[PDB]
Amino acid sequence: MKLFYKPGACSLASHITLRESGKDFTLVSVDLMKKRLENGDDYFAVNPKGQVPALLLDDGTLLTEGVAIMQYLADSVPDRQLLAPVNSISRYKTIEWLNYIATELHKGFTPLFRPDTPEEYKPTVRAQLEKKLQYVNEALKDEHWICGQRFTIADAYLFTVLRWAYAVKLNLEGLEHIAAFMQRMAERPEVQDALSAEGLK
Amino acid sequence: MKLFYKPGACSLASHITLRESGKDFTLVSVDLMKKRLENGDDYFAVNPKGQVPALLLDDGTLLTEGVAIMQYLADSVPDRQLLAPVNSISRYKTIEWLNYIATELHKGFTPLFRPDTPEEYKPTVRAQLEKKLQYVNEALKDEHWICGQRFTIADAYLFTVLRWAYAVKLNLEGLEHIAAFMQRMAERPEVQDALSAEGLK
Numbered sequence: 502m503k504l505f506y507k508p509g510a511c512s513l514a515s516h517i518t519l520r521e522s523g524k525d526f527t528l529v530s531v532d533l534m535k536k537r538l539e540n541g542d543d544y545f546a547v548n549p550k551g552q553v554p555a556l557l558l559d560d561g562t563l564l565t566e567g568v569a570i571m572q573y574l575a576d577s578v579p580d581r582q583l584l585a586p587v588n589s590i591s592r593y594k595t596i597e598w599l600n601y602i603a604t605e606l607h608k609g610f611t612p613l614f615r616p617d618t619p620e621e622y623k624p625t626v627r628a629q630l631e632k633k634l635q636y637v638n639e640a641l642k643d644e645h646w647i648c649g650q651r652f653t654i655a656d657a658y659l660f661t662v663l664r665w666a667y668a669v670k671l672n673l674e675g676l677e678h679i680a681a682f683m684q685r686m687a688e689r690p691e692v693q694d695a696l697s698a699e700g701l702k
Numbered sequence: 703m704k705l706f707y708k709p710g711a712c713s714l715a716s717h718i719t720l721r722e723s724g725k726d727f728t729l730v731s732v733d734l735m736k737k738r739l740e741n742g743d744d745y746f747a748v749n750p751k752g753q754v755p756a757l758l759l760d761d762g763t764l765l766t767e768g769v770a771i772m773q774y775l776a777d778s779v780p781d782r783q784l785l786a787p788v789n790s791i792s793r794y795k796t797i798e799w800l801n802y803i804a805t806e807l808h809k810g811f812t813p814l815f816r817p818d819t820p821e822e823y824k825p826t827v828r829a830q831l832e833k834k835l836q837y838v839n840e841a842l843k844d845e846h847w848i849c850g851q852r853f854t855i856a857d858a859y860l861f862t863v864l865r866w867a868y869a870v871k872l873n874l875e876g877l878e879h880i881a882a883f884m885q886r887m888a889e890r891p892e893v894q895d896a897l898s899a900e901g902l903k
């Protein structure tokens with residue numbers, strides 16, 4: 502199994518998930534500017550969307566989209582409870598958080614990292630993300646995981662995107678539940694292993 | 703069971719799914735500018751996020767996020783085959799499509815439909831959307847449904863978002879598989895009933 506990723510990118514969520522689920526995998530670095538692998542090979546030949554993450558299965562299947570990848574991992578290890586069983590409302594509340602993170606936060610930060618984003622637009626994005634982060638702060642007021650008492654793939658994804666709020670210096674004052682979630686997350690051995698493996702901090 | 707919607711908005715995907723799964727529901731229109739229900743009640747009191755769609759379950763559970771709602775409905779009626787069963791690769795491919803549509807197409811359209819979006823930015827967004835539509839056109843070349851042989855929840859969501867490509871007048875010329883798909887979707891009686899109930903054409 503191979504995970505195509507870039508350090509610090511959204512692929513970290515799938516990476517943390519591969520470890521939390523105890524999977525054997527190889528990391529393959531991608532230059533997202535040039536769309537090449539470490540070896541000058543075109544990346545558009547592996548993933549036509551030219552994006553990370555992408556997971557190559559053993560039976561040669563290429564699976565893209567981080568949310569599809571994490572459900573794929575989570576489902577193969579029901580013993581881990583990284584995702585609740587089908588037809589239980591808990592499962593859907595976790596999927597609700599995954600889509601909120603994907604569409605509202607992840608894609609919300611994207612223009613800030615895009616070279617084609619016009620400068621006068623960037624301040625508008627920051628201001629929109631601020632409101633979003635305040636809703637996230639009150640959602641973690643329980644000071645546990647995003648979906649309650651149990652750790653799920655939604656936590657791997659929230660933590661991954663929340664790191665960008667720190668990298669870009671969004672005003673995070675008063676948002677104490679976020680700060681505590683980030684510490685709780687960093688104390689997990691598999692996210693630490695994943696962070697080290699990517700050469701992160 | 704109640705679906706909070708707005709004619710033509712993204713809630714159409716969940717509305718088509720509610721009909722395709724054979725559910726009984728009440729459609730409740732939401733004034734998205736004022737966040738008021740058709741009767742004057744505060745919408746923020748139902749959905750704290752202020753967006754459509756939202757599904758109010760009989761038990762009183764409120765589920766938000768289109769992708770979450772569509773998966774909850776499909777799984778509940780396994781006999782209808784709107785989403786493949788857990789652990790089948792087919793299931794993850796549909797989820798892969800759902801996330802692509804959610805994050806790249808739906809959220810990709812969003813700035814076009816907003817005022818704070820600077821006018822010189824609109825051309826870049828349209829341009830990006832047309833490039834994605836080309837990828838979707840090729841993904842539909844064997845002329846079936848988005849996931850192949852069977853109609854799934856990805857088709858309902860792809861159709862919903864493609865309606866805006868036409869509304870907005872993106873350049874859809876030469877994309878013949880996309881045109882065939884729209885026609886295939888128009889001829890499904892459950893989608894005809896949904897367009898009709900929403901007062902659409």
Ligand SMILES: N[C@@H](CCC(=O)N[C@@H](CS(=O)(=O)O)C(=O)NCC(=O)O)C(=O)O
Nearest residue numbers: 510511512533551552553554566567805
């Ligand atoms: N819909 C994709 C989005 C993937 C994505 O945006 N990946 C980015 C990396 S990150 O900014 O999100 O960390 C990328 O590869 N971008 C390169 C490009 O889009 O050209 C998903 O959810 O997996």
Ligand SMILES: N[C@@H](CCC(=O)N[C@@H](CS(=O)(=O)O)C(=O)NCC(=O)O)C(=O)O
Nearest residue numbers: 601604711712734752753754755767768
């Ligand atoms: N992440 C949500 C987004 C929902 C959404 O953007 N809904 C829009 C309607 S539409 O543009 O998708 O048709 C809305 O209610 N917007 C009102 C607002 O955000 O103030 C989802 O996937 O369901």
